[PDB]
Amino acid sequence: WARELGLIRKPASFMTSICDERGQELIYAGMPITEVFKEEMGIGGVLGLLWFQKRLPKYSCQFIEMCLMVTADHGPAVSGAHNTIICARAGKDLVSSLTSGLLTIGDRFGGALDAAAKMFSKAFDSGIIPMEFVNKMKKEGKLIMGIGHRVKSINNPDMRVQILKDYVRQHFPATPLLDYALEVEKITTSKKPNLILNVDGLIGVAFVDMLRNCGSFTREEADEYIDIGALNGIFVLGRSMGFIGHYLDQKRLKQGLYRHPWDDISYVLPEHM
């Protein structure tokens, strides 16, 4: 009642700019939900409005959807899907199973996106040619992450790297960082034939290329969302689809609680403490 009459001030915390639940209708960035549906923007459109607060162009939103669908699943033997299947098989709900699978996503599992994006961004922004960049990575004792596949090497392409790469070639306006990464893989395939750009590296370099190459980004914000970790959100949001599918599959097959075999442990406990 005393704030209705406006005779008090309370310091309002919890500053936000991605949703306006009050009023008449839902407003994501500055535009209502009916204008979201009337302009026929996809799910990449609402990632543009919710994560970046900007109306991305149609090729950028379609590319965001495209890099979500290739990220959707990569089998159950990966570590997060293994966690999802273990937690779902122990009688838990969807939230706990998906959550225990998502918490595996860190630096080793799914960390090639953001770190590969930062690696190629720091390579391209510092003015180093790819021939010197590969030697600098070799003599610093760490691998170029985002580059290197196990089996599929030369005239046997990854076939989802190819689709994303083709869509970036015809639809993006200018591709400096993608061409830089193409030169780096042209060097590393001359080294060993299976050192191609992964999907984890190509989504990263094309996402940085999209942010710093299309409109509405002012060249500190395009380099800020990389540092905050918007590449990780793409991977986690994409792989949540496959993890929920893994939960529904392990609950539909009706499989009882898993216990690991004792012959796959090799206990090395001390003799007596």
Binding site: G6, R9, P11, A12, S13, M15
Partner: protein, 157 residues
């Protein structure tokens, strides 16, 4: 060249340190005097990163940028001619010497009482050499009704 007009309605200031109560009282004094612009342009605190602090301009929420270093606060706000040093008795001397390297500052109010007299004499000598007016130390500040208030003088509204 010590100027005879220290504060006016166009007077902006940089507060050195986390004194959000003092900055809120500053903004309240600026709002009650029917002044168009806030007199706090930026805040300098070396122990935190560059961010924004949420303050009141009457009823409205406004953002005052808090900077880690002093140089970026001086570059982004060239209209600042007042620095109010809320540093302690051992960190006021070096902060005042760092302030006086910038030629835009015409007055510094040093609020902290305690400083040794030889360092204060060095401050006085450089103030006479540069023309910067130093209000203090060991003061609560100075108030000009209608134009500007320094720190905690007067009190709340």
């Amino acid at each position: 060249g010590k100027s005879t007009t220290l504060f006016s309605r166009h007077t902006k200031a940089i507060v050195w340190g986390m004194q959000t109560r003092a900055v809120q009282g500053m903004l309240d004094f600026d709002y009650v005097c029917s002044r168009d612009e806030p007199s706090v342009a930026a805040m300098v605190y070396p122990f935190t990163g560059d961010h924004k602090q949420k303050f009141y301009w009457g009823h409205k929420e406004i953002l005052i940028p808090v900077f880690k270093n002093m140089a970026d606060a001086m570059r982004k706000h060239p209209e600042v001619d007042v620095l109010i040093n809320f540093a302690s008795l051992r960190s006021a001397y070096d902060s005042t010497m760092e302030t006086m390297n910038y030629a835009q500052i015409r007055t510094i109010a040093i609020i902290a009482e305690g400083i040794p007299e030889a360092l204060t004499r060095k401050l006085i000598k450089k103030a006479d050499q540069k023309g910067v007016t130093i209000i203090g130390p060991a003061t609560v500040g100075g108030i000009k009704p209608g134009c500007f208030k320094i720190g905690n003088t007067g009190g709340m509204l």
